[PDB]
Amino acid sequence: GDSYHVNARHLLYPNCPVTRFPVPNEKVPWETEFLIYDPPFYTAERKDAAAMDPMGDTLEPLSTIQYNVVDGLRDRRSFHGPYTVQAGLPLNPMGRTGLRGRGSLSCFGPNHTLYPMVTRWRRNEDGAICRKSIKKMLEVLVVKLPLSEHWALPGGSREPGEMLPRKLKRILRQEHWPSFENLLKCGMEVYKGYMDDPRNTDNAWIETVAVSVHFQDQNDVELNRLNSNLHACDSGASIRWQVVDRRIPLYANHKTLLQKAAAEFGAHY
Amino acid sequence: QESLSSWIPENIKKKECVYFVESSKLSDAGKVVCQCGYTHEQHLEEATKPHTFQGTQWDPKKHVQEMPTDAFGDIVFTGLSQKVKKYVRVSQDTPSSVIYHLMTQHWGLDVPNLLISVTGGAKNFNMKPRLKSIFRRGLVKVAQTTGAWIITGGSHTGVMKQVGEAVRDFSLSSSYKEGELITIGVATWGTVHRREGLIHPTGSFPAEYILDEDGQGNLTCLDSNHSHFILVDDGTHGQYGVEIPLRTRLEKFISEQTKERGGVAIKIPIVCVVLEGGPGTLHTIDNATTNGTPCVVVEGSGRVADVIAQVANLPVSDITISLIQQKLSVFFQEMFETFTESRIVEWTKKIQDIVRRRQLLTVFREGKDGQQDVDVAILQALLKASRSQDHFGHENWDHQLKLAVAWNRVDIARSEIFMDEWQWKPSDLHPTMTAALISNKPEFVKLFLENGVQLKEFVTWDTLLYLY
Amino acid sequence: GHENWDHQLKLAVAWNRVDIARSEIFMDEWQWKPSDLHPTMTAALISNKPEFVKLFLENGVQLKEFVTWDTLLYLY
Ligand SMILES: Nc1c2nc(Br)n3c2nc[n+]1[C@@H]1O[C@H](COP(=O)(O)OP(=O)(O)OC[C@H]2O[C@@H]3[C@H](O)[C@@H]2O)[C@@H](O)[C@H]1O
């Protein structure tokens, strides 16, 4: 199977009763000839307002923002490379999605968000690291919202830069202590760039930063402060640690992050 | 039982450390380790003393000392079965006659007719179902009909688990003689997960042992289906393989003892059946074939087994280093990437020395040809190995008959011993017949009467006094 | 967790047929303690299914440890 964005090519775009054009694996990349490509032009109704981009109907000359550069409050520049622009509209760098317009994303091009992951070891009753057949066990702190039916990483939209730690964790972690954890959020990076999503059009896609904060010792240290920063539920259902596995019940694309995360430490899968 | 309870600490010794020298590399969550780090800041059960010097680089036999042993007794698994399993703790170096005396006299075991020593991969693995069923049924069948000891590692992982499941299948059947299938397991005292509950001096006669799979470190748990346990001790917690120098000595001491029933007397034969394996399994196969012990290697489901199963048919000079490395890469495929190029010359040299002894090795060839059963294959391999021995005169064809009458089964002696190429006089058939007359074996009497012994010439006066 | 290998057993005991649970659920790769086999056994005891009782008795549940006071009130 060729590594394509099959979750974006997925039919029946979420929360909008529209269908997209059938794009098979030969048809996906922009280089190959595909003449009958007729992607419908569709944007969400709430994409003509404020903060979010007014380029939903960008046949008008309202499309005047700077492309692959930080155009003011929206740092519209890709982590992957300089994206090609046609008729004042960006194209998806990975291939055809079969759906034109803005969709449900904020702005054109990439939409920069953040997903941080906290990893720790799994100790037994004595306090030594538990093991599968060759590798070891990892535990990660994940959160379930009451209206998602899917456990997810604690990462939100990076509309602010350094407050996106707090914006992901305003209902979850804290207010004052959240800035203290944002000070400690400078860790090690794993993967940055394009990420698969069902809310991806030909013009709007999601690029992300994957930082990995880790706890080595499982005794008394920073973790007691992370457990002491628990003001867990303001508008969320539950939040807890969870042991890693391939059959980990999570959001669909986020497992693709963890398959890149467990390679950085040597866990099992 | 009280006489056993007196006898065991007077005769058996154990090792323990007395000197605390702290280690450079701190262990995972047990950072204080005094070069063994058993359970204290100091790897000792003695007074904290300067000992007139601080000897760095503590020499193992010069540091540790022997003492009476406390861990002996009987054990039960908490909630898995209701039978009892005997177990004992021994030192690293004991005379094997002491262990044999403990096994035969006080534990209550008769002398075995056959000694099967199964070895395989300690890492867990999976196998084809039909070959699994054939392997279980054949091993259970031969160890039942012979009355043979099965000696293995006493761990829950790997091939020892499969032997345990075969024994558990026979105990699920449980038709007759449940005490026929005895299996001993020899394991290191250090790598036992819940060993602290076992330690109780002067007899821990009911000892409840809990187990939790996957809730353990590098050290592992005991298997449950084994019947007897011998736990060798060096006094070192973080180590593997202390049982390997003791297992070969114990098996080689058993393999000279003579079990004599009736008129005939034999020496106990030893065979090893090997599975998937590793480097230590290949070293064990080479060490066995140097001494003369026959080996049976099962084709399929193995790394080291299916190396030998393929390379066995080709001649010795045709085996080359590149061929060995190429077949190593297709079978290992991860360790082969981690393997160096300096070990593969050692491996092809060992494989050439192993296949050079064409007689002592036998490959299973499951399904294809000669695959009647595992039991007849093991018996045929053992009888071929006894046939290949050097002999003056025709004592070998007599010795195979005494072996086949010592085992109860008659189809083996019919199939190959009486088939061809001995040209024996019936008078020489006389002394085994007496044994077949004494031990109530009518089938062997029928076979010898068919093969030509005359009962009028056989029964004389002195043999009538001997039979009465 | 290991709720899936429990759920397949509850499904296979909900259907009357026993060869399916013998063929694949108990064949390999669960490593279960017998205590966790306890609550389905009660159901197999109630609905008059002796074959599942024979299978669980073969697979290792101890009847002395299983029958306690509160489960005796529940069975009555
Ligand atoms: N009894 C054990 C044993 N128990 C454990 Br937990 N290990 C063991 N290694 C060797 N043996 C004995 O040695 C024989 C040959 O073992 P092999 O060469 O096939 O082992 P590999 O698969 O290469 O290593 C498996 C891992 O488990 C560890 C090892 O230290 C190693 O880290 C076995 O039949 C057995 O009798």
Side-chain angles (χ1 to χ4, degrees), chain A residues 1 3-25 28-30 32 34 36-37 39-40 44 49-51 54 56 61 67-68 72 76-85 87-93 95-98 101 103 106-124 127-131 136-146 148 150-156 160-161 165 178 187 189-219 232 236-244 249-258 261-263 265-269, chain B residues 3-15 18-19 29-30 37-38 47 50 55 60 64-65 67-69 71-77 79-80 84-127 129 131-171 179 181-193 195 197-207 209-212 215-217 219-238 240-241 244-275 277-280 282-298 300 302-313 315-332 338-340 342-357 359-365 367 370 374-389 391 393 395-418 422 424-427 429-456 458-468, chain C residues 1 3-26 30 32-35 37-64 66-76:
Chain A
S3 290
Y4 291 153
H5 49 293
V6 300
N7 217 311
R9 289 199 283 143
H10 170 56
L11 191 147
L12 197 49
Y13 188 83
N15 204 358
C16 317
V18 299
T19 82
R20 69 187 72 210
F21 190 79
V23 193
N25 282 349
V28 190
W30 296 109
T32 311
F34 198 43
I36 324 103
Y37 187 30
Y67 278 28
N68 65 19
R76 311 141 58 95
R77 188 185 64 246
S78 176
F79 286 86
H80 188 89
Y83 47 86
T84 307
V85 189
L89 307 178
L91 294 198
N92 172 263
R96 290 172 169 94
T97 67
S106 48
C107 73
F108 279 162
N111 300 264
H112 292 339
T113 181
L114 174 61
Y115 285 133
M117 38 189 54
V118 43
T119 72
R120 81 179 194 192
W121 300 98
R122 171 180 190 191
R123 303 309 170 87
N124 49 5
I129 47 172
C130 297
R131 274 199 184 101
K136 280 85 62 177
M137 286 308 191
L138 267 291
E139 311 174 325
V140 291
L141 188 138
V142 298
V143 57
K144 179 141 182 157
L145 304 177
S148 177
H150 272 282
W151 291 82
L153 294 168
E189 326 295 324
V190 186
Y191 179 76
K192 310 185 188 198
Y194 180 53
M195 194 184 61
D196 214 356
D197 197 284
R199 286 161 311 160
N200 276 24
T201 64
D202 291 311
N203 321 323
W205 59 89
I206 306 300
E207 296 182 2
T208 325
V209 191
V211 75
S212 87
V213 51
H214 183 78
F215 283 160
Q216 204 61 46
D217 168 73
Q218 202 67 237
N219 311 8
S238 314
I239 171 158
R240 69 178 187 190
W241 293 91
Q242 192 62 39
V243 56
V244 190
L250 206 67
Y251 212 86
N253 76 94
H254 285 202
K255 315 181 56 182
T256 310
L257 277 83
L258 267 297
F265 283 84
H268 84 100
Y269 200 75
Chain B
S3 160
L4 180 148
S5 308
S6 64
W7 190 93
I8 284 176
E10 302 181 52
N11 298 259
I12 310 172
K13 300 320 275 176
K14 77 178 184 64
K15 286 185 177 292
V18 296
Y19 174 74
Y38 199 77
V64 306
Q65 306 285 46
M67 278 198 287
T69 318
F72 79 108
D74 193 327
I75 207 173
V76 74
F77 297 91
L80 296 197
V84 306
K85 276 86 170 176
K86 306 295 183 69
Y87 82 114
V88 78
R89 174 182 182 197
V90 305
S91 92
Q92 152 83 21
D93 43 348
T94 63
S96 316
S97 48
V98 167
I99 295 181
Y100 187 75
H101 191 274
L102 164 68
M103 266 188 312
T104 62
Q105 293 326 291
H106 304 334
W107 266 358
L109 301 180
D110 45 353
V111 185
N113 294 314
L114 178 55
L115 188 65
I116 302 178
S117 178
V118 54
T119 182
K123 298 283 289 285
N124 208 319
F125 72 106
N126 207 326
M127 63 165 313
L131 192 78
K132 183 193 285 188
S133 69
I134 289 169
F135 173 75
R136 288 177 177 178
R137 221 178 61 248
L139 172 65
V140 159
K141 178 64 66 67
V142 57
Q144 198 270 330
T145 184
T146 294
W149 292 3
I150 301 178
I151 174 169
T152 174
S155 85
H156 199 285
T157 171
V159 163
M160 308 152 248
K161 207 177 72 62
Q162 297 183 0
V163 176
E165 296 262 7
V167 169
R168 195 179 66 85
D169 278 17
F170 182 75
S171 60
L181 290 206
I182 63 171
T183 74
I184 63 173
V186 174
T188 320
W189 171 249
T191 82
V192 171
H193 172 86
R195 69 149 173 278
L198 296 186
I199 302 184
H200 170 52
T202 76
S204 88
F205 305 135
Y209 172 72
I210 59 167
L211 80 162
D212 39 353
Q216 66 259 30
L219 75 163
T220 185
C221 294
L222 310 186
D223 201 297
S224 67
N225 302 306
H226 286 350
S227 166
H228 297 245
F229 285 88
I230 302 176
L231 309 184
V232 308
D233 192 8
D234 190 271
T236 291
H237 190 195
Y240 280 157
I244 301 186
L246 195 137
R247 275 184 67 239
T248 77
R249 267 199 293 107
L250 180 60
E251 286 181 19
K252 220 173 63 177
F253 174 68
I254 283 177
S255 175
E256 292 104 11
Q257 301 318 303
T258 77
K259 175 166 179 285
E260 174 259 355
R261 292 284 96 88
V264 304
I266 57 167
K267 293 190 289 184
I268 313 177
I270 170 169
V271 76
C272 58
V273 48
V274 62
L275 289 182
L282 180 135
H283 164 56
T284 309
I285 289 174
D286 197 342
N287 172 245
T289 55
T290 50
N291 280 356
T293 294
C295 308
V296 169
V297 44
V298 194
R303 38 175 85 93
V304 188
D306 302 335
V307 165
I308 305 302
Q310 299 186 355
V311 78
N313 307 333
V316 55
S317 295
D318 306 4
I319 301 167
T320 174
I321 170 68
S322 69
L323 188 147
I324 291 291
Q325 177 186 198
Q326 192 265 328
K327 283 163 166 67
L328 187 145
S329 282
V330 305
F331 269 107
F332 275 65
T338 76
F339 281 160
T340 179
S342 59
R343 75 177 292 101
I344 58 186
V345 45
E346 190 59 90
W347 274 34
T348 182
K349 167 64 158 28
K350 277 196 163 177
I351 285 172
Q352 275 189 147
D353 282 334
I354 279 172
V355 183
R356 193 130 75 256
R357 302 135 200 183
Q359 302 281 157
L360 297 153
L361 184 140
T362 301
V363 300
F364 195 53
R365 241 354 92 50
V374 177
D375 53 357
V376 299
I378 288 175
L379 264 296
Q380 278 259 57
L382 184 48
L383 268 164
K384 179 185 63 179
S386 48
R387 191 156 41 215
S388 88
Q389 204 155 60
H391 55 85
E395 315 191 303
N396 196 0
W397 284 84
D398 177 76
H399 187 273
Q400 299 185 27
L401 189 52
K402 306 208 290 321
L403 266 188
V405 75
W407 304 320
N408 189 67
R409 43 174 53 248
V410 78
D411 54 354
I412 297 309
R414 181 182 294 276
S415 88
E416 58 163 351
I417 313 191
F418 281 123
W422 186 14
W424 66 97
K425 55 188 291 186
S427 158
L429 211 68
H430 270 178
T432 87
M433 169 67 159
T434 290
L437 209 63
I438 284 187
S439 316
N440 205 301
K441 291 178 183 175
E443 285 282 339
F444 277 80
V445 180
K446 186 177 310 303
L447 182 58
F448 299 152
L449 261 295
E450 189 263 358
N451 263 344
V453 61
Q454 304 309 293
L455 265 180
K456 313 261 301 182
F458 161 66
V459 181
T460 172
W461 187 265
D462 300 291
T463 201
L464 196 66
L465 265 177
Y466 186 75
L467 265 293
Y468 266 110
Chain C
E3 315 191 303
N4 196 0
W5 284 84
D6 177 76
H7 187 273
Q8 299 185 27
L9 189 52
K10 306 208 290 321
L11 266 188
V13 75
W15 304 320
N16 189 67
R17 43 174 53 248
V18 78
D19 54 354
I20 297 309
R22 181 182 294 276
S23 88
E24 58 163 351
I25 313 191
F26 281 123
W30 186 14
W32 66 97
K33 55 188 291 186
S35 158
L37 211 68
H38 270 178
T40 87
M41 169 67 159
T42 290
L45 209 63
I46 284 187
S47 316
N48 205 301
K49 291 178 183 175
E51 285 282 339
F52 277 80
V53 180
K54 186 177 310 303
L55 182 58
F56 299 152
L57 261 295
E58 189 263 358
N59 263 344
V61 61
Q62 304 309 293
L63 265 180
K64 313 261 301 182
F66 161 66
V67 181
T68 172
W69 187 265
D70 300 291
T71 201
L72 196 66
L73 265 177
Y74 186 75
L75 265 293
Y76 266 110

